[PDB]
Structure formats: C-alpha cells, structure tokens
Amino acid sequence: ANQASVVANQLIPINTALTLVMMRSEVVTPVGIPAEDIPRLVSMQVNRAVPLGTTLMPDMVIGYAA
C-alpha cells in the first residue's frame, strides 16, 4: 500500500552524480528504491540515463545495496 519510491524529478544523465533536485518521492507501482534512501543516493551514479518520472530501481544505481 503507501510505500513510496524514489522517482526521477528530471532526466538523470548517465554517469552523473545524483543531487537532491533530481529525486522526488511518490507512491508508484511497481515499488523501486524506498523514498527513505534519497540521502544515501546523493552523489551515487546511475548506469543508464533515467527519463523524467521514472521510478529509480536498485539495478540502475552503481554501488547500491539496500
């Protein structure tokens, strides 16, 4: 039910360090990375460009383990 995930608040380019303006939280399905983890994700990189509105999934972030 209302488990929120991290959602791309702008297109996130490949191999670019994540900043706080790039991540919002929303209740989406399927569930992705928990919204609680937005602070952890700061300055981690994604391995593929992430379009606006896409749910950030564990496999997209280089070095992510929950």
Swiss-Prot record:
Signal peptide: none annotated. InterPro entries: AFP_Neu5c_C, AFP_Neu5c_C_sf, Antifreeze_III. Residues 5-64 form the AFP-like domain. Coiled coil: none annotated. It comes from the Eukaryota. It is found in: Secreted. The keyword Secreted applies. Keywords: Antifreeze protein, Secreted. GO terms for cellular component: extracellular region. Detected in blood serum (at protein level). The record marks Q10, N15, T19, Q45 as: Important for ice-binding. Belongs to the type-III AFP family. Contributes to protect fish blood from freezing at subzero sea water temperatures. Lowers the blood freezing point. Binds to nascent ice crystals and prevents further growth. This is Type-3 ice-structuring protein HPLC 12.
